[PDB]
Design a protein around this nucleic acid. Sequence first.
RNA 1: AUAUUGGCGAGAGACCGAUAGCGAACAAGUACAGUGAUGGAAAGAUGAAAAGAACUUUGAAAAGAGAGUGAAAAAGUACGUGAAAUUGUUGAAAGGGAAGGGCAUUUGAUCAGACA
Lengths: 211, 173, 125, 156, 137
Amino acid sequence: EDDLMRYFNSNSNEPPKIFLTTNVNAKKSAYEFANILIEILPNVTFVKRKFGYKLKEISDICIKRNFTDIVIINEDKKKVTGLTFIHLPEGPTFYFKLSSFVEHGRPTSHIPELILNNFQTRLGQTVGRLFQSILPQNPDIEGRQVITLHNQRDYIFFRRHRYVFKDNERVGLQELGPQFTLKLKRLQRGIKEETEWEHKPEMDKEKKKFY
Amino acid sequence: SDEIVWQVINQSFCSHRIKAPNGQNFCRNEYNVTGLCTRQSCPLANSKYATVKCDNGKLYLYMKTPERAHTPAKLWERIKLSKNYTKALQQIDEHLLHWSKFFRHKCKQRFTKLTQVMITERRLALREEERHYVGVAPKVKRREQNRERKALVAAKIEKAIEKELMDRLKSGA
Amino acid sequence: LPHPKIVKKHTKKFKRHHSDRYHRVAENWRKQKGIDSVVRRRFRGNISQPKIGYGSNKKTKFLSPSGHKTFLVANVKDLETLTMHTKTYAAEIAHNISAKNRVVILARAKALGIKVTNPKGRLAL
Amino acid sequence: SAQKAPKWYPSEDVAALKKTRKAARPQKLRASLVPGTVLILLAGRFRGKRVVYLKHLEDNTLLISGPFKVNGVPLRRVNARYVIATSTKVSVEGVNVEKFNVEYFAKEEIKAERVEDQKVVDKALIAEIKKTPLLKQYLSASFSLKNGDKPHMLKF
Amino acid sequence: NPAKSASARGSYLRVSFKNTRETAQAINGWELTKAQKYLEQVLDHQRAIPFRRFNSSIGRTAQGKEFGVTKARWPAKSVKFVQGLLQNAAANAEAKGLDATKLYVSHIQVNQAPKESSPSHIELVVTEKEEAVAKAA
RNA sequence: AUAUUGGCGAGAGACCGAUAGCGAACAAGUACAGUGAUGGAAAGAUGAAAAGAACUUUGAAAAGAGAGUGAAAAAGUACGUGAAAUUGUUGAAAGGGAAGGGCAUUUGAUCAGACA
């Protein structure tokens, strides 16, 4: 539980270095997408991935270079489609699906504050755990930037905003940063060897549950 | 005979032809050398017919003798073709002694391509690919469209943040 | 396979006369049968007609830009016909083939080295 | 089927090329290109530059130097047609240009050997440029076309 | 954003279509409080609706100078249907829990209905006008 | 033995597939028109199962927005699929007494492979 918090996920002890790579032979939109993750994630290095070094051979490099997490974005066609967060030692790994990206905010260099919604389910709070870990644990209050991760279904929406406080019990906020929708898949448990959940269409049949 | 077999399948049906838009004709009778079909390049019209095939990794060269026109059960006599390329082309040559120069270099040619089909192993040793083709069934395409549009409506993200900023900064005053 | 450079002679579509004027007249070509038509008597400034002079080069006829003749394929047994003719013909997976079977045909065509003209057909992730 | 297979098939056997009677002959350059001539380049990195002409190469190029000490043009290969050849000539006989060839320029920061070879050539060439007045100033400056210049009339 | 929106719709409404088109586009892109006040003024002949497309034999008036049009009319019945919908959309917004003051009609659309009669469908979608922003060095 | 476009009752089709096939697949010889003899239409399909939308809110109400049912309301009795004419909205572009068309290109939009 508390032992888990540290052993599988990154805590407020180090700066977490995130090895941002891309699926082989990707085009403009993937790097355009990498430029949006270059801002939001704490200490990203972009690695141009040049054919070979299967997966374990990568892990050997990021042990030596001493990274914490791997993130890989993929493209079937000209649109971005899938996002894969892996933790480098042990390997709790989360796969995701993007069906929304639309682009007037233009943010500062100040580091954004986190907020999460509706993770009653234990599988939900293990994903909430990932985004608590992978995003910065700095929040500088001033600069007034908020990153959300709302999950009212099995769909998770992340957005950025600017909050203005008036003393009459109300707060205003403007749209900023990338529009986004994610879907959880897999939880491969080993680096890529094992599964814990792996979405099927055998769900959607229930119309409920919500993991 | 065989001229009568040819004319009756040239027109009047060879019921395994593919008419390509190029006007080309392809016999899919598994035992032909050229995938295309023409006179004595398709294995029914011709009576003497050689071919290279593969059943496993073992590349055999099948051979059809006019002796066996009576019995279709044992038509194609077959011989294994070692595995090294140089001795195999030499192995080929001896079988094709005193035949048409058609089957001479064309079985040599079948063997060539089918050996460089064993570039499959090259693709399958250095596989380790993190992609794999996924179908997009149009039912799922709407279970994951019309439920996201129903999610956002019931989500009320603004009100959720408006709550959990006031509820935060009252307790963190 | 070594081919000449492709010269098309007429890149444009031979649209029917007054197909753009009226909606009931289809864009599909028909010859103006009437004796007093200025199209039939091929006047200056009137639409060009299909005639045999526009015939494509025989060595580069039916060829896609890559110098390949397109060949429709439904399944593995029909794809296996183009084993010997890899640099002449290229596979075209038929429109009605399911997403389950397209992955079978694409993997098999990769193995034999036969070129598929239409990948990404029903290959959504 | 779905396209019944054709009766005739075109042959798979690749045809051997017919014997070509096209024998390569060495390039006959124009008379204005004599080894040791002040050139003006037209296209490339060094457009509008005055340049010393040194050697005719094997791949129909021409080997030329600035010198690099004067105008910033090193030992370059150049095309014959991309070049203006003026009448002014410097002596070239004292330069050891004979060493390098086509194989010297194979590409597949800057190599030190290239800088050393440059300085060896450039010393033996300034040895001649220093003689005639203002020629070093003429090499340093860039060629252009002023308003009213007719290249068909400008006897270069 | 569907979260920042409310929408009313009237269907198979026995109104003149050609009048409804004009009074719909007259009110398009306006703040809700200004919009409802405007239609009250049209009812009392204070302001007139600018007629632009379906505008034959309309009496020329001075009140059209606001919109840069010579022709203008006071169509009581058509406006009556529209302010009924706007009152409905206002209550639809307060059902969801939107702000009333920052509300404006974004998409108002009117098209013909099955028929002789000449009935018409109307739909209008009201939206928040979101500003509320700050920065830090 | 032969005839048999009626009646009673079967069996069939290289026939038609809702502007076809009988006039009529259906409240069809019906609605209706004609003083009357007569003339005589149009009109098929929710879904596997009504599970035909409980409840909340807005409105005088029809209805609207939520919510729910269903595999799918992109199936809600105006219900299979839903073309074009014609219209609305949104985005781009053009427009000094016509427009659409051809040859060629700029510009803007958009797209195909090859680099497996």
